[PDB]
Amino acid sequence: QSVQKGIAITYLHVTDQIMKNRDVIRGENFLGNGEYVTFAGILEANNKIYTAPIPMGLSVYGSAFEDGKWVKYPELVKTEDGGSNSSSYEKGELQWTQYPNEAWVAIYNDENFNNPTLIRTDKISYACGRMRSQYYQTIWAADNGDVYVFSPSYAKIMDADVQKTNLPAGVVRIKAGATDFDSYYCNLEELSGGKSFLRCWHITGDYFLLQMYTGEINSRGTGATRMAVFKATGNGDKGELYYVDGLPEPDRISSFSGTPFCENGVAYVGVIPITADGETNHPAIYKIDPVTHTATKGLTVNATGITAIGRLAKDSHSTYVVSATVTSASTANYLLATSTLESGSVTPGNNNGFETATGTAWIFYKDQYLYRLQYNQGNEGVTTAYELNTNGGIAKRSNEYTITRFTTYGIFGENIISSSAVDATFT
Numbered sequence: 001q002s003v004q005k006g007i008a009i010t011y012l013h014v015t016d017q018i019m020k021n022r023d024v025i026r027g028e029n030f031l032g033n034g035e036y037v038t039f040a041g042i043l044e045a046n047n048k049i050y051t052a053p054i055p056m057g058l059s060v061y062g063s064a065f066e067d068g069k070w071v072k073y074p075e076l077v078k079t080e081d082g083g084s085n086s087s088s089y090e091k092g093e094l095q096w097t098q099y100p101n102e103a104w105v106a107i108y109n110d111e112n113f114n115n116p117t118l119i120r121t122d123k124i125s126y127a128c129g130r131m132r133s134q135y136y137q138t139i140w141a142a143d144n145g146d147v148y149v150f151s152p153s154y155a156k157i158m159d160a161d162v163q164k165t166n167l168p169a170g171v172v173r174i175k176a177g178a179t180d181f182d183s184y185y186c187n188l189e190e191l192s193g194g195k196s197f198l199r200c201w202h203i204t205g206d207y208f209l210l211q212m213y214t215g216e217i218n219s220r221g222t223g224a225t226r227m228a229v230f231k232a233t234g235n236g237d238k239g240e241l242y243y244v245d246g247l248p249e250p251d252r253i254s255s256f257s258g259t260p261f262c263e264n265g266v267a268y269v270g271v272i273p274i275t276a277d278g279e280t281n282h283p284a285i286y287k288i289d290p291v292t293h294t295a296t297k298g299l300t301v302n303a304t305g306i307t308a309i310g311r312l313a314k315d316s317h318s319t320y321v322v323s324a325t326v327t328s329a330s331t332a333n334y335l336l337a338t339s340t341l342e343s344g345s346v347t348p349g350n351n352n353g354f355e356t357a358t359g360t361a362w363i364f365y366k367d368q369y370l371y372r373l374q375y376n377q378g379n380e381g382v383t384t385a386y387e388l389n390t391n392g393g394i395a396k397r398s399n400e401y402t403i404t405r406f407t408t409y410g411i412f413g414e415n416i417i418s419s420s421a422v423d424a425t426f427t
């Protein structure tokens with residue numbers, strides 16, 4: 001028995017609030033070159049699970065294995081601890097992949113994560129966005145079940161030339177029910193004016209929303225203050241990309257709220273300004289119409305930030321929920337109720353004061369529950385969940401758990417699923 005890298009999987013089962021730690025999956029040599037992986041995203045489509053196994057380089061175990069067999073670039077192996085935050089490294093590791101010019105997708109026939117089908121492409125680098133410790137999902141399904149695998153080519157900012165990818169940001173495709181790539185390929189940098197992206201989502205049909213970088217990619221996801229609409233089958237199945245018109249221009253935007261809320265063929269996203277002085281400059285929710293790639297200003301949020309947008313319902317009661325942060329001399333979080341995202345305002349206070357702890361990731365399960373996932377660096381994550389009660393008020397569900405540290409999440413079936421690469425002992 002020895003300490004190896006593994007893939008931890010946590011299930012948050014929404015019907016009964018049960019939390020399950022899966023047996024840890026062996027991550028050493030997950031892709032056949034010795035490197036270990038971090039899952040990026042958990043996508044359900046065609047009754048399968050799709051994730052992107054993002055290579056991490058070699059663990060200490062990986063660089064020791066069979067007399068260093070897996071070490072292609074020994075000049076990159078570390079001889080002491082170093083690095084910072086979630087990118088700290090230890091003596092003997094080879095940090096980040098030696099194989100940046102490829103992407104993998106792992107496909108599972110159900111949520112037990114047994115017997116993956118693994119498919120490799122040379123057309124794109126690995127399929128995830130990166131923000132501090134977090135691995136953002138960039139694999140998404142069209143309405144017909146075709147899965148589009150996007151890569152922002154994050155690896156371009158690696159220090160070591162051999163660890164940089166030379167592939168532009170781009171997209172490939174897995175047709176519904178298939179477990180091979182087809183021939184589809186779109187070079188996104190040729191459509192975006194040379195720009196890449198932080199993360200992306202599905203809007204409707206074959207329209208996807210990309211949160212675009214304004215300049216160079218960076219490790220903190222800052223300055224990703226444009227949106228663009230991608231029509232995957234546009235221009236004779238070559239892809240079409242349009243920057244969104246009608247949002248505040250980038251030098252007014254501090255950040256976007258994160259995961260959009262999609263209904264009725266459009267996307268809603270929160271915009272947090274750099275300077276929020278005066279009501280017309282407070283954070284606000286914008287509606288993005290993918291057909292016209294046009295945004296319109298909607299609900300104003302009289303708070304410091306916006307962190308989630310969705311819908312909660314119970315019996316005949318139903319409301320939009322906007323998660324909003326308020327920073328003073330620390331930071332409070334409020335779940336604000338509204339019947340519209342497109343006008344008026346919401347303000348934390350006596351008639352809208354459901355306070356929660358802050359969260360790193362906010363996930364709506366359908367219109368039934370809101371899950372908060374709190375990231376705590378090297379320590380355990382924390383999760384709470386929220387619903388409408390039978391009176392129609394927002395309420396916290398009773399079970400509050402520490403969970404394995406997570407760096408990605410998604411949904412399959414009745415489970416919110418979260419994952420990260422962990423140390424584990426195996427036979």
Ligand SMILES: O=C(N[C@H]1COC(=O)[C@@H](NC(=O)c2cccc(O)c2O)COC(=O)[C@@H](NC(=O)c2cccc(O)c2O)COC1=O)c1cccc(O)c1O
Nearest residue numbers: 084085086087131132133134219220360375376377378379
């Ligand atoms: O809110 C989060 N952090 C807090 C608390 O974390 C910390 O204070 C420190 N941090 C760790 O010790 C850490 C130890 C082990 C693991 C860590 O991830 C640590 O961060 C320093 O991080 C920082 O100063 C900043 N951080 C990065 O620049 C970063 C750069 C590259 C890579 C990073 O991970 C970075 O944090 C800001 O982050 C914070 O202050 C937070 C949120 C979302 C995702 C995060 O990763 C956050 O950490």
Ligand SMILES: [Fe+3]
Nearest residue numbers: 085086132133
């Ligand atoms: Fe961090």
Ligand code: NA
Nearest residue numbers: 081082083084
């Ligand atoms: Na360093």
